[PDB]
Design an enzyme around this catalytic site. Structure first.
Site, short mmCIF file in Angstrom:
data_model
loop_
_atom_site.label_atom_id
_atom_site.label_comp_id
_atom_site.label_asym_id
_atom_site.label_seq_id
_atom_site.Cartn_x
_atom_site.Cartn_y
_atom_site.Cartn_z
N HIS A 217 0.83 -1.20 0.00
CA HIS A 217 0.00 0.00 0.00
C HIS A 217 0.87 1.26 0.00
O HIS A 217 0.62 2.19 -0.76
CB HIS A 217 -0.93 0.00 1.22
N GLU A 218 1.89 1.26 0.85
CA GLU A 218 2.79 2.40 0.96
C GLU A 218 3.69 2.55 -0.27
O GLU A 218 4.00 3.66 -0.68
CB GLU A 218 3.64 2.28 2.23
N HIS A 221 1.86 4.42 -2.92
CA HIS A 221 1.96 5.85 -2.65
C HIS A 221 3.28 6.37 -3.20
O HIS A 221 3.32 7.42 -3.85
CB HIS A 221 1.90 6.12 -1.14
N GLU A 242 -5.79 8.12 -1.11
CA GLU A 242 -5.93 6.88 -0.35
C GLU A 242 -6.94 5.95 -1.01
O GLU A 242 -6.80 4.73 -0.95
CB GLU A 242 -6.35 7.18 1.09
O1 LIG Z 1 -2.95 4.77 4.53
C1 LIG Z 1 -2.32 5.24 5.46
C2 LIG Z 1 -2.92 5.30 6.85
C3 LIG Z 1 -3.06 3.90 7.44
C4 LIG Z 1 -1.94 2.99 6.94
C5 LIG Z 1 -2.11 1.59 7.53
C6 LIG Z 1 -3.47 1.04 7.11
C7 LIG Z 1 -4.59 1.94 7.63
C8 LIG Z 1 -4.50 2.02 9.16
C9 LIG Z 1 -3.15 2.60 9.57
C10 LIG Z 1 -2.04 1.68 9.05
C11 LIG Z 1 -2.98 3.98 8.96
C12 LIG Z 1 -4.42 3.33 7.05
N1 LIG Z 1 -1.09 5.73 5.31
O2 LIG Z 1 -0.58 5.92 4.03
ZN LIG Z 2 -2.23 5.26 2.54
#
Ligand SMILES: O=C(C[C@]12C[C@H]3C[C@H](C[C@H](C3)C1)C2)NO
Ligand SMILES: [Zn+2]
EC number: 3.4.24.69
Length: 397
Positions: A217-218, A221, A242
């Site tokens: 996920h990161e 980004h 997001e």
């Molecule tokens: O998306 C996020 C925030 C979150 C990342 C992880 C997944 C969810 C819950 C926590 C950990 C904060 C969204 N950061 O880029």
């Molecule tokens: Zn995020």
């Protein structure tokens, strides 16, 4: 055992099986500095990618203290060398797990090629690197040397579970939204995770998110911001950025007309970068060849070149790169590749936070994660079930 190499002789993405105990060499193990701070020992797991096994008290002068004013706190975390060695081995393990999938290979490849643009000069006919897109690498003799980089994985700040992808900005330019890009810093921990409820079909189950998915996920980004096509965080309470990164039916809530306006905006943004490369006649930064750097960014943005050596943006080539970075590289698509359980929407997580350890292969594998094959954890995502596989998850608050 760690099980870092399930098949083959060596890891396919991470270049070395690093120990934190390993001595510095100034190449892939060194003390570095982020452009006042004390030098920190970092590890170069891949080209353009560094890992700093320390709590993040460097990037933000307002978060230089691990003080507690969905969240979790522990100022003792990542303080001993054993933890830093476990953090390091955990992150490298997640990269190999990500790189074990076709989607992960494409994503990581795109990231490495996504070198931050050289646009730090005030002369429009001069290419210049930006200082914030570099780190100082201390040598065994004790001398600095400026090294460019795309990605840094670092430990979390005060709030441990609050993972995010951030970077240093420009006083004039918006590097994450103008196509240039900048060195991305990902606050992450492979030693923690968050939970979510899911009626499997008794009552609803209490599962935990696979840390491989969260890291991915990161990285998505990062991919957006490295190519400077990230959505302005004012667009939202959950931002469009997001929602795009999560993917699936979540990203469809963004109207297609808004998508076309974005896609056309960055299409012209890439055009300006092409024109700048065409007017480049000189270069500041000694040895670095002008002809070599023009090719670097030609390769990066997939620009066409005519007989006279002029760069330009191909329409359907840009759409390919844009669709790849924004529509194909999603958290949802990684869940499918991993074949694991995950929350169905971005905000569908509970307040639960768990302590884990993915390093031993008896706990977590590169191929399966928690859901170990040939066992009772392979069925109905039992490996991610905090009730059944409770030995792997420790409830925290
Ligand atoms: O998306 C996020 C925030 C979150 C990342 C992880 C997944 C969810 C819950 C926590 C950990 C904060 C969204 N950061 O880029
Ligand atoms: Zn995020």
């Amino acid at each position: 055992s760690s099980g870092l190499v399930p098949r083959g002789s060596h890891m396919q993405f991470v270049n070395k099986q690093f120990n934190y105990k390993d001595p510095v060499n100034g190449v892939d193990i060194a003390y570095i500095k982020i452009p006042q701070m004390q030098p920190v020992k970092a590890f170069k797991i891949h080209n353009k990618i560094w890992v700093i096994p320390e709590r993040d008290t460097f990037t933000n002068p307002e978060e230089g203290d691990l003080n507690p004013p969905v969240s979790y706190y522990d100022s003792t975390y990542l303080s001993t060398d054993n933890e830093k060695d476990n953090y390091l081995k955990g992150v490298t393990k997640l990269f190999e797990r990500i790189y074990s999938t076709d989607l992960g290979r494409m994503l990581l490849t795109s990231i490495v090629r996504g070198i931050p643009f050289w646009g730090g000069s005030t002369i429009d006919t001069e290419l210049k690197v930006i200082d914030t897109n570099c780190i100082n690498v201390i040598q065994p003799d004790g001398s600095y040397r400026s090294e460019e980089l795309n990605l840094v994985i670092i430990g979390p700040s005060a709030d441990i579970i609050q993972f995010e992808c951030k970077s240093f900005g420009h006083e004039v330019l918006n590097l994450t939204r103008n196509g240039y890009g900048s060195t991305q810093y990902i606050r992450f921990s492979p030693d923690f995770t968050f939970g979510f409820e899911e009626s499997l079909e008794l009552g609803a189950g209490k599962f935990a998110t696979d840390p491989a998915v969260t890291l991915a996920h990161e990285l998505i980004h990062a991919g957006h911001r490295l190519y400077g096509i990230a959505i302005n965080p004012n667009r939202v309470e959950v931002s469009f950025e997001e929602l795009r990164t999560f993917g699936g039916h979540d990203a469809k809530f963004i109207d297609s007309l808004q998508e076309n306006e974005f896609r056309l905006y960055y299409y012209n943004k890439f055009k300006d970068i092409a024109s700048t490369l065409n007017k480049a006649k000189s270069i500041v930064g000694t040895t670095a060849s002008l002809q070599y750097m023009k090719n670097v960014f030609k390769e990066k943005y997939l620009l066409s070149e005519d007989t006279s050596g002029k760069f330009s943006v191909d329409k359907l080539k840009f759409d390919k790169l844009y669709k790849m970075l924004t529509e194909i590289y999603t958290e949802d698509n990684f869940v499918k590749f991993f074949k694991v359980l995950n929350r169905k929407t971005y905000l569908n997580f509970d307040k639960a936070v768990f302590k884990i350890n993915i390093v031993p292969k008896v706990n977590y594998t590169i191929y399966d994660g928690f859901n170990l094959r040939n066992t009772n954890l392979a069925a109905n995502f039992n490996g991610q079930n905090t009730e059944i596989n409770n030995m792997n998850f420790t409830k925290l608050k």
